Design a protein around this nucleic acid. Structure first.
Ligand SMILES: [K+]
Ligand SMILES: [K+]
Ligand SMILES: [Mg+2]
Ligand SMILES: [Mg+2]
Ligand SMILES: [Mg+2]
Ligand SMILES: [Mg+2]
Ligand SMILES: [Mg+2]
Ligand SMILES: [Mg+2]
Ligand SMILES: [Mg+2]
Ligand SMILES: [Mg+2]
Ligand SMILES: [Mg+2]
Ligand SMILES: [Mg+2]
Ligand SMILES: [Mg+2]
Lengths: 108, 299, 50, 134
RNA sequence: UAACCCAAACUAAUUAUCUUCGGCGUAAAACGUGUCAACUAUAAAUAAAUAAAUAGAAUUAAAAUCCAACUUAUAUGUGAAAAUUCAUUGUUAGGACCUAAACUCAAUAACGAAAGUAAUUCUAGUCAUUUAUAAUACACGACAGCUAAGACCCAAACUGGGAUUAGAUACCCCACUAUGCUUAGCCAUAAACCUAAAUAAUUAAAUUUAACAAAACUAUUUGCCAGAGAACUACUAGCCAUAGCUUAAAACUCAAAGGACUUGGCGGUACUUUAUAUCCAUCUAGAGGAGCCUGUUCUAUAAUCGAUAAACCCCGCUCUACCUCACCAUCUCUUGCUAAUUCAGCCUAUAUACCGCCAUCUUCAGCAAACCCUAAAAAGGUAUUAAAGUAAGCAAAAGAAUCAAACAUAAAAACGUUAGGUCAAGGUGUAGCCA
């Protein structure tokens, strides 16, 4: 662009950073609604443990439960955090192990 | 032609067709038999298949052995083979009754699908042929956009002779479109699956050939004032007067384009045209592409 | 679905006319007139006038 | 710039290509030499892939006459392909190859003998990991 | 388990800190065409006189069409037919018509802003603003399409009849229509692209500054672009358009999308030469039938195993009455071949862990290390009146054997191909059995 064109337009317009699953918040608290399995996109082949939760904001989201084995059930309380599950499409939330009803993986 | 080798999709096609348990199914152009296998595994009481190619008959016969007493194979043309008495007469139902226990499903080439449905549409008007059992439903494959026209509504760019002819005789529903990549040889167009159920009361109650002529003359020029197309039904000497009378009696604005002619509009035209054909029987035989050939001093 | 599009087009244009008419009523009412200017009739500009 | 720049269907293509190439060789359109050769065409056989087009021309008695006819015909085969695309006989034409057909000589031979015949009365390797260690 | 990092912290989540002097032929982007403003830059006082710009009027050579005379028995059409046709056909230095389009020239490169424009004649007509720079204005805008009235030679979506195929709504044939033409109105779209914005420079900066296009680069002014799909989409607004046209998002979802090159492959390599006891042909004796001998499969038995398309089937076997023997039934032995050994022994599973020895293409012709060169190389490296290639191996050839000589026959035949065959020639990895 010419200097006259740069002057008339000024600095480049920067669209604001889009909010993610946590809505620009470190963590959210949600109530478990259902516990189900999600199938990772091929080439990945597994039965990943996830749960649907109603977050404090009022929306409903799917959250991956990390660790080998969880005791979560409906009506339980959990603290979810950010971080996408790469193989699971649409799963942008994860459960925090060791907070509220969710407990640390049981080393056996 | 295009073949379907995916057993998952044939099972999906049967699943889309609904419950075939205890139903007398007539399959057209079974070919390799992928659809035939799915129909046989749907608790079908009796299945009759007509394959014109003798090369595929041995494959069908082998499938018949795998399903003893469930498969019937005829080496013939679907366009000519008569199924009026293929199934017992006790399953026949009245035209106003619920659809009989007869359902015609099949994946045919598009060369065969278009002539087959046109002949069957006349049979629906005649209530004969495959429709002697009543308002038999047909789940047939067509070219993606031919199916769009079979279901296209008034004013649609796909609205044409397929829309008026098919819809006035049947309730036409486009189920889904199958991708072409899985077909051998590969077609460059997708394949639309259409479900057709004959109507208890046809939208137009005139001879099938009369409706076909009126629909054809109307849609010969899609972008013209319909008055242009309807004029070709009448000899030039009486074209101006008769065309004005026809539109005046049918209560249609002469400037309405063929695409904006609804099913009820054609019914009014067909009803008026029927009276005119009774007044002059020679009018029904007029062809504008032949009178003009024979007008130039035929002698 | 062209039929619906024409139906949507004719109903969209009708709302487009009402918005035009209402915007003209706001102007004279705000100015303090209690009736539209004498010999004025809002032109119908979105109808099949051509 | 210039230097860089420089079943039923086969029955239809085989017959039409023969019908057209016969006309090209009946005039000097290809060349005056090709016209003077007075070449005759037995048949045209197009391959299934359409990679090439065989043109069978009735060979003669003299080998020298045939050797000359072959060279002249082959040189013009590329140009002959141009004339068929330009007159709009066929949109796509394969590289035309000229083949000999000596059956014509045999066909005359049979009649001569047959007339005279006596019928009688009726990763680790790629990586520096191994190297860095020592 | 060890190591590494940080350390009274540590690791996750979230948020913030980094912000336009870059581009617009092929990747995002010059967005159909010209003209008039205000700025910003620039500086000269010309232009035009041009072959097919454009509009109008008149005109007509070739080929059709129609009427008439004469006239074959056919004409038409395809790769081959059918349909169509005899109210046809051929000829006419006969008449009528003036519909439509403009051969050669044109191997030319003119005109116009673009679209576009080349039969002849005549009339009107292009021209000076220093130059670049314009929309919310004005005027145009191929083809296709609509409206009304005409035209209609031929062509022709479509429609109908005839063929085709395992079947084509296809490709092909015949007939005919919208339409292509004209005069009045509308539509405003093209890969409307020379895919190049418009101007004034320069040819040196020891500048292929990716590559392919079209040598490169500088200055000026405007327009445009900012990862991809969603999207020539939704909505809004304008419009004789009403499925349209122009303008043009978000959610959403991902780590790619995209461009130019180079290679390898197989596809239908079916094409031209090719095989040589071979693909067909030629020739001789056989096999395929009968009887037996023998291998295999099957059936079948308490009763081996392996080979088992070419490249198994008188195969391991140049060899099973016992032995051979690895199989089956039944009885018996437990430190049970050896100098020693909580050891001996093991034809127990995997030839898809291997050695070994082979089949196969095969008497096929390739496999090619080390150097050297390239405006960078993903690779390539030949010219003999020679132009970047070179000097060494492996196979072939040669040599030797069949006891003169040749020829022939044997032998030889690299690297790969078939996880080809063989754990049962033997040896062996791993796992399994030890009254
Ligand atoms: K037809
Ligand atoms: K081996
Ligand atoms: Mg682009
Ligand atoms: Mg004229
Ligand atoms: Mg003049
Ligand atoms: Mg016409
Ligand atoms: Mg909007
Ligand atoms: Mg084996
Ligand atoms: Mg023995
Ligand atoms: Mg023994
Ligand atoms: Mg043993
Ligand atoms: Mg020797
Ligand atoms: Mg040798």
């Amino acid at each position: 662009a010419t200097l006259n064109q740069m002057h008339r337009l000024g600095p480049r317009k920067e669209p604001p950073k889009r909010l993610g699953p946590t809505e620009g918040r470190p963590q959210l608290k949600g109530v478990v609604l259902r516990t189900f399995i999600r199938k990772p996109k091929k080439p990945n082949s597994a039965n990943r443990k996830c749960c649907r939760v109603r977050l404090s904001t009022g929306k409903e989201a799917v959250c991956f439960i990390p660790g080998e084995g969880h005791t979560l059930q409906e009506h339980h309380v959990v603290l979810v955090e950010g971080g996408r599950t790469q193989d699971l499409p649409g799963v942008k939330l994860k459960v925090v192990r060791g907070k509220y009803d969710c407990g640390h993986v049981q080393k056996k | 032609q295009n073949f379907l080798l995916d057993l998952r999709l044939t099972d999906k096609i049967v699943r889309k067709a609904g419950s075939l348990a205890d139903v007398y199914v007539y399959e057209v152009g079974p070919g390799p038999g992928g659809i035939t296998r799915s129909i046989l595994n749907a608790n079908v009481a009796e299945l009759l298949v007509v394959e014109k190619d003798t090369r595929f008959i041995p494959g069908l016969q082998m499938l018949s052995d795998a399903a003893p007493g469930k498969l019937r194979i005829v080496h013939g043309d679907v366009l000519t083979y008569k199924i009026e008495k293929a199934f017992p007469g006790n399953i026949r139902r009245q035209w106003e009754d619920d659809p009989p226990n007869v359902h015609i499903i099949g994946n045919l080439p598009f060369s065969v699908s278009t002539p087959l449905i046109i002949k069957w549409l006349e049979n629906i008007s005649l209530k004969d042929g495959p429709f002697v059992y009543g308002r038999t439903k047909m789940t047939l494959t067509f070219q993606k956009e031919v199916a769009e026209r079979l279901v296209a509504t008034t004013g649609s760019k796909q609205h044409s002779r397929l829309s008026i002819m098919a819809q006035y005789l049947c309730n036409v529903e486009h189920l889904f479109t199958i991708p072409g990549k899985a077909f051998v040889p590969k077609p460059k167009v997708d394949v639309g699956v259409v479900h057709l159920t004959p109507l208890i009361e046809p939208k137009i109650k005139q001879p099938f050939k009369l409706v076909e002529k009126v629909v054809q003359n109307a849609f010969q020029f899609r972008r013209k004032y319909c008055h242009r197309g309807l004029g070709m039904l009448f000899p030039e000497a009486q074209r101006l007067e008769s065309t004005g009378r026809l539109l005046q009696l049918a209560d249609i604005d002469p400037t309405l384009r063929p695409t904006h002619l609804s099913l009820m509009h054609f019914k009014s035209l067909c009803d008026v045209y029927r009276k005119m054909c009774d007044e002059d029987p020679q009018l029904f035989t007029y062809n504008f592409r032949e009178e003009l050939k024979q007008k130039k001093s035929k002698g | 679905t062209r039929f619906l599009r024409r139906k949507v087009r004719e109903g969209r244009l009708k709302k487009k006319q009402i918005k035009f008419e209402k915007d003209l009523k706001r102007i004279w009412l705000k100015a303090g007139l209690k009736e539209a200017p004498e010999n004025w009739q809002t032109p119908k500009i979105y109808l099949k006038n051509k | 710039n210039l230097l860089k720049k420089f079943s039923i269907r086969l029955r239809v293509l085989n017959g039409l290509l023969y019908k057209s190439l016969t006309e090209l060789l009946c005039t000097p359109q290809v060349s005056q030499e090709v016209y003077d050769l007075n070449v005759e065409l037995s048949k045209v056989s197009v391959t299934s892939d359409f990679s090439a087009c065989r043109v069978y021309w009735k060979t003669g008695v003299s080998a020298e006459q045939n050797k000359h006819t072959e060279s002249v015909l082959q040189r013009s085969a590329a140009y002959m392909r141009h004339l068929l695309i330009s007159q709009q006989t066929l949109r796509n034409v394969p590289p035309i190859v000229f083949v000999q057909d000596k059956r014509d000589l045999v066909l005359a031979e049979v009649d001569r003998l047959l007339a005279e015949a006596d019928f009688g009365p009726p990763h680790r390797d790629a990586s520096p990991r191994s190297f860095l260690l020592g």
